[PDB]
Amino acid sequence: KVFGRCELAAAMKRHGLDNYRGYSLGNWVCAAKFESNFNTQATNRNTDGSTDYGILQINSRWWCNDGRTPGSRNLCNIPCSALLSSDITASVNCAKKIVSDGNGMNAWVAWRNRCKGTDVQAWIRGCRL
Ligand SMILES: CC(=O)N[C@@H]1[C@@H](O)[C@H](O[C@@H]2O[C@H](CO)[C@@H](O[C@@H]3O[C@H](CO)[C@@H](O)[C@H](O)[C@H]3NC(C)=O)[C@H](O)[C@H]2NC(C)=O)[C@@H](CO)O[C@H]1O
Numbered sequence: 001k002v003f004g005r006c007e008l009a010a011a012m013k014r015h016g017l018d019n020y021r022g023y024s025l026g027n028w029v030c031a032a033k034f035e036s037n038f039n040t041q042a043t044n045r046n047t048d049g050s051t052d053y054g055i056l057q058i059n060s061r062w063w064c065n066d067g068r069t070p071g072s073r074n075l076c077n078i079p080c081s082a083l084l085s086s087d088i089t090a091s092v093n094c095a096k097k098i099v100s101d102g103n104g105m106n107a108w109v110a111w112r113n114r115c116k117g118t119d120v121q122a123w124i125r126g127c128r129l
Pocket of ligand 1: 098
């Protein structure tokens with residue numbers, strides 16, 4: 001499913017992401033935009049052999065099990081395919097664990113390079129929240 005900007009904002013808010021760990025909603029929407037272009041089915045393989053999954057491009061080396069990443073840690077205890085669902089619950093629950101792991105949102109390379117330090121509030125402009 002390819003979410004619309006405000007549609008995603010609403011879903012993430014509903015799932016408790018607004019200001020989770022001090023990160024406003026605009027940060028999460030900006031991250032999803034640049035990580036997957038709001039597409040829940042997005043996947044991208046990395047050089048180390050791991051793969052990033054879904055709306056928030058969660059990596060198989062640490063967070064989920066895809067059965068083909070030797071050394072995967074599976075910290076969110078879920079098959080990576082669960083992160084591609086049209087329902088973002090699994091992705092959100094796992095993201096909460098990731099952002100709490102010590103490096104905050106820096107865990108998302110696109111957030112660090114394209115969202116961090118920008119006016120993220122613009123990402124939720126005009127949305128009925
Ligand atoms: C969204 C996504 O999946 N992002 C991936 C990153 O999570 C990953 O970065 C590495 O993540 C691990 C797990 O959070 C980091 O290890 C943690 O480091 C912190 C502080 O340094 C420490 O407090 C934690 O104990 C430790 N976690 C454990 C359980 O070992 C690790 O530092 C990150 N590596 C780097 C280079 O930032 C990167 C890299 O694989 O991939 C993203 O896709």
